[PDB]
């Protein structure tokens, strides 16, 4: 049985949702191990993942990192679970495109809001500037996602791992006090994602409600 190491509420939410969909749709249970930021820098965890971060999926002798690799792997093993919102190559790729945008381009913009560059620490003006630029970048990227939702209810034909990724980044925005109320589709999107049983179960497990 596979095991996922994750930080609750972090990007590892997405493979956690994927695993729960596999559970609900393909009848395969899995283990979730919530980790602390202290544990992931521990000698024990570093021996499994020298990069000292999450997600990490363990499936027997396979220790697999990277959000996109994990979910593409699960999709290959369990095509019937429709992790990318469809079974057809074209539609899966379109959802994979959104996942990749979120994971490679958007998540990136958040990094300075979670961990300030070393050169900025103690510099009030530079710190403010870096945080401002991150906020502006995020809002510009969210506007692009929001525009898509003007004509589509999800980032797949049905709900997909891309939707889970945007959802969690919007939860980060709420926690950081980065408002997105001007992007008119995002609130309803969050409600639709929250209505999915797999998402609901994971939000419960990771302590994300309320």
Using CB under 8 A as the criterion, which residues of the chain lie in contact with its own copies when the complex forms?
Answer: 50-51, 59, 62, 64-70, 72-73, 76-77, 89-90, 92-94, 96-97, 99-101, 103-104, 107-108, 117-119, 126, 129-130, 133, 144
C-beta of 126 vs 208, nearer to its own copies: 126
Q: Output the CA–CA distances (angstroms, integers) from residue 125 to 88, 129, 139, 176, in the order listed.
A: 50, 6, 21, 19
Please name which of 30, 72, 36 lies closest in space to residue 53, comparing C-alpha atoms.
36
- CB under 5 to 8 A by kind: which of its own copies, Cl ion, ligand GSH, none does 37 bind? ligand GSH
* Residue 62 contact, options Cl ion, ligand GSH, its own copies, none, Cβ 5-8 Å cut-off depending on partner type: its own copies
Which residue number, 153 or 172, has a Cβ lying nearer to ligand GSH?
Answer: 172
Contact partner, 161, from Cl ion, its own copies, ligand GSH, none, Cβ < 5-8 Å per class: none
Binding site residues, ligand GSH, CB under 6 A: 7, 10-12, 37, 40, 52-55, 65-67, 100, 103-105
Q: Measured from the CB atom, is 134 or 141 closer to Cl ion?
A: 141
Given the complex with its own copies, which of 21 and 84 has the nearer CB atom?
84
Measured from the CB atom, is 16 or 94 closer to its own copies? 94
CA dist 28 and 18 (Å) reads 12
Q: CB of 50: closest distance to Cl ion in angstroms?
A: 8
> In whole angstroms, how close is the CB of 56 to Cl ion at the nearest point?
9
Give me 168's structure tokens.
């969690």
Q: How far apart are CA 166 and CA 183, in angstroms?
A: 13
Q: How far, in whole angstroms, is CA 210 from its chain's centroid?
A: 19
Cα-flanking dihedrals φ and ψ of residue 11, to 5°? -60, -25
Query: Using CB atoms, what's the residue nearest to ligand GSH?
Result: 53
Question: CB of 119: closest distance to Cl ion in angstroms?
Answer: 26
Compare residues 65 and 86 and give the one whose CB is closer to Cl ion. Answer: 65
Whole-angstrom Cα distance, residue 98 to residue 81?
18
Residue identified by tokens 């997405």 is 14
Instruction: Tell me the DSSP string of 90-152.
Output: HHHHHHHHHHHIIIIIIHHHHHHHHS--GGGTT-HHHHHHHHHHHHHHHHHHHHHHHHHHTS-
């Amino acid at each position: 049985s596979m095991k996922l190491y994750g930080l609750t509420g972090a990007c590892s939410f997405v493979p956690h949702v994927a695993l729960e969909w596999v559970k609900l749709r393909a009848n395969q249970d899995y283990a979730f191990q919530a980790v602390s930021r202290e544990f992931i820098k521990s000698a024990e965890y570093l021996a499994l993942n020298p990069r000292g971060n999450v997600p990490l999926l363990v499936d027997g002798d396979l220790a697999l990192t990277q959000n996109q690799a994990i979910v593409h792997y699960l999709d290959e093993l369990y095509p019937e679970a429709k992790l990318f919102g469809s079974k057809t190559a074209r539609d899966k790729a379109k959802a994979a495109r959104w996942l990749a945008f979120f994971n490679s381009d958007v998540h990136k913009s958040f990094v300075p809001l979670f961990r300030l560059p070393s050169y900025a620490e103690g510099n009030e003006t530079l710190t403010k500037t870096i945080r401002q630029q991150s906020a502006e970048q995020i809002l510009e990227q969210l506007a692009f996602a929001n525009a898509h939702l003007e004509n589509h209810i999800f980032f797949g034909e049905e709900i997909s791992v891309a939707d889970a990724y945007l959802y969690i980044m919007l939860n980060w925005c709420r926690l950081l006090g980065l408002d997105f109320s001007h992007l008119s589709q995002l609130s309803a999107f969050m409600q639709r994602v929250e209505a999915d049983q797999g998402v609901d179960n994971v939000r419960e497990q990771e302590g994300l409600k309320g």
